[PDB]
């Protein structure tokens, strides 16, 4: 019945609308605007930095995603980071990961 308008995974905002069919009444149908927002709560500011301060201002511009730092992560997108480790005397720079089951090469 309803169709999906916006399914962006950056801000994790789901925008959709549905028309409700009433009884045999005049043309006074009610139009709705379904919005789904998931608060990250326990997440960092930068996308590739786990030492960022905890989020405090959750600003969501509804007029900007219907035409950029993303709070929520993506299951189908891999996130990598580099941290300087030693493990002895040589300072190597390996590539790390942020989310499980999302960075396995094909």
């Amino acid at each position: 019945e309803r169709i999906v308008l916006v399914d962006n995974k950056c801000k994790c905002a789901r925008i959709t609308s549905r028309i409700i069919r009433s009884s045999e009444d005049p043309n006074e149908d009610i139009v709705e605007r379904n919005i789904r927002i998931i608060v990250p709560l326990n997440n960092r500011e930068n996308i590739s930095d786990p030492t960022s301060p905890l989020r405090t201002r959750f600003v969501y511009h509804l007029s900007d995603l219907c035409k950029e730092t993303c709070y929520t992560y993506d299951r189908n997108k891999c996130y990598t980071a580099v941290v300087p480790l030693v493990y002895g005397g040589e300072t190597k720079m390996v590539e790390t990961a942020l989310t499980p089951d999302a960075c396995y090469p094909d």
Partner: protein, 228 residues
Amino acid sequence: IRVFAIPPSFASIFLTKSTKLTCLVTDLTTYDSVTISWTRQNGEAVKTHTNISESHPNATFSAVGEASICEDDWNSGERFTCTVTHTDLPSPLKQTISRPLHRPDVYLLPPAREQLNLRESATITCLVTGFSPADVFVQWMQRGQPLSPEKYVTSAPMPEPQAPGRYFAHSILTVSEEEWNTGETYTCVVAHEALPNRVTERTVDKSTGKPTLYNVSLVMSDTAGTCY
């Protein structure tokens, strides 16, 4: 005796893709041996002109000429001089014409709720303002199918009272009042010379409008960060 040469309009370029200039030599005496000729400023002629007109009921002869040119040969600034000859004019009269930007803005205005209370008919108005120059063609389509020419009429261009160098155009499409049960898409497509693709299609259905109910179901969880 009147001589007028109407320049080709933009409506015949986006749809027919064949520009043509014609000079009217109507309201003249009823005599034969009338030849239509176009003289350019560089020394080139035009193609064969056929399909002449008949005589008016008021005992005046009418003629029509054809001159097929290219689109690039009109916007550069080439001037065409149409010259004709007759018996009453010792000298061949000549009439020369020539052509003397901002991105267009398209807005669709849904009908008010007072019109739908009568349960008689509904009108859809697509407001197009803030564009230059004038003479813009506006057409309506239904799911990719153009409608009848007599179903919609494009208003004549009018200078904007506020903007010193912009114009606005209006276009209405009256349909049945009960047609809103589905929507029939009812896009608004305009063609202007100040666009790369010259295609601006906007759709406003029943669902797309001013909703009267909002329920932002927001949730908070400690393990958030996946967005299933």
